[PDB]
Design an enzyme around this catalytic site. Sequence first.
Site, short mmCIF file in Angstrom:
data_model
loop_
_atom_site.label_atom_id
_atom_site.label_comp_id
_atom_site.label_asym_id
_atom_site.label_seq_id
_atom_site.Cartn_x
_atom_site.Cartn_y
_atom_site.Cartn_z
N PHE A 33 -11.78 -20.02 -15.50
CA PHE A 33 -11.12 -20.83 -14.44
C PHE A 33 -11.40 -22.32 -14.69
CE2 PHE A 33 -12.51 -16.69 -13.08
CZ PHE A 33 -13.89 -16.72 -13.17
N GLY A 34 -11.23 -22.76 -15.94
CA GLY A 34 -11.63 -24.12 -16.34
C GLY A 34 -11.30 -24.45 -17.78
N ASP A 139 -16.34 -8.93 -18.42
CA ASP A 139 -15.32 -9.65 -19.23
C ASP A 139 -15.78 -9.77 -20.69
OD1 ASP A 139 -12.68 -10.56 -19.31
OD2 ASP A 139 -13.07 -12.37 -18.13
N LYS A 141 -15.07 -9.74 -24.15
CA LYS A 141 -13.92 -9.97 -25.06
C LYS A 141 -14.39 -10.94 -26.17
CE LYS A 141 -11.61 -13.47 -22.19
NZ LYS A 141 -10.14 -13.58 -22.39
N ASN A 144 -15.29 -14.42 -25.64
CA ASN A 144 -16.51 -14.58 -24.81
C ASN A 144 -17.76 -14.35 -25.66
OD1 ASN A 144 -15.51 -15.67 -22.64
ND2 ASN A 144 -15.40 -13.77 -21.39
#
EC number: 2.7.11.1
Length: 282
Positions: A33-34, A139, A141, A144
Amino acid sequence: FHSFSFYELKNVTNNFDERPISVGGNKMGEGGFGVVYKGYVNNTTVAVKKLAEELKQQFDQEIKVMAKCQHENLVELLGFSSDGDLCLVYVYMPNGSLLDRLSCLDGTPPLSWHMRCKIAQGAANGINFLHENHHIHRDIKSANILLDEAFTAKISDFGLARASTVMTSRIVGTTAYMAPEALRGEITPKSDIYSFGVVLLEIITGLPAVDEHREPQLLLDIAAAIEDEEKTIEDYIDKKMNDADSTSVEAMYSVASQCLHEKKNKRPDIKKVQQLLQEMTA
Ligand SMILES: Cn1c(CCC(C)(C)O)nc2cc(C(C)(C)O)c(NC(=O)c3cccc(C(F)(F)F)n3)cc21
């Protein structure tokens, strides 16, 4: 650790230059979210996440976890900013994301089989530490799993993380990596194992988990057809490495396949994964 002001983070990130670092701006990536920016605080190169309500949750969450959980395979946070949108400061990861390196984005050399086998163990060792500390990432992935000057795998993004067969109305994660039960609202460490199996698959093939222009779209599906002797891993093994061994590549597909059992309870636990990944590098 420290509490940087908006203005310093602003001043050392050239006012959050959204131009990409390649053009000679500061933008490194867009996630959690950024947007992640290159910074230079305390005479050290760092990464500054400017946060785009529930937002304050994902912020103060990513502090709590990051303050309890430090490990060689988890990114470290240096500090943050509340003064005027929120910001999080991390230790720079010079080789960026495993995704970007897997696609050789910006012209980086392909990762060897060797570097690929150590990145897999790293990522396992980071999850396990998360799982030993009663934490679900939610999350896991490619994007990440970040890479240092040593190409040491470091798991990022815990702004979705949750502490630990429970159910949630706010379903969240990445479709192309998510497990069926996680996709229906189950919060279980066993979901983190499945996502990881997709990552193993990306490491083996160099393919993204989704490609809207590929038949088939989803890597998950390439794995299913292989499990149905409609395809071979051998045919999908990433061609962009010269060190790959059939035994070794097959040993890692093995771990993946087991990680991708649609039955949560038929999935290995992180230790079995850690162990299996070790026995392959022996
Ligand atoms: C040096 N760099 C290159 C350029 C790659 C080269 C120089 C090899 O072309 N791309 C990069 C991409 C990333 C992203 C943001 C996509 O993860 C980052 N990241 C970080 O530095 C970082 C570090 C800790 C925590 C976080 C955060 F993700 F916010 F949690 N990010 C560095 C990168």
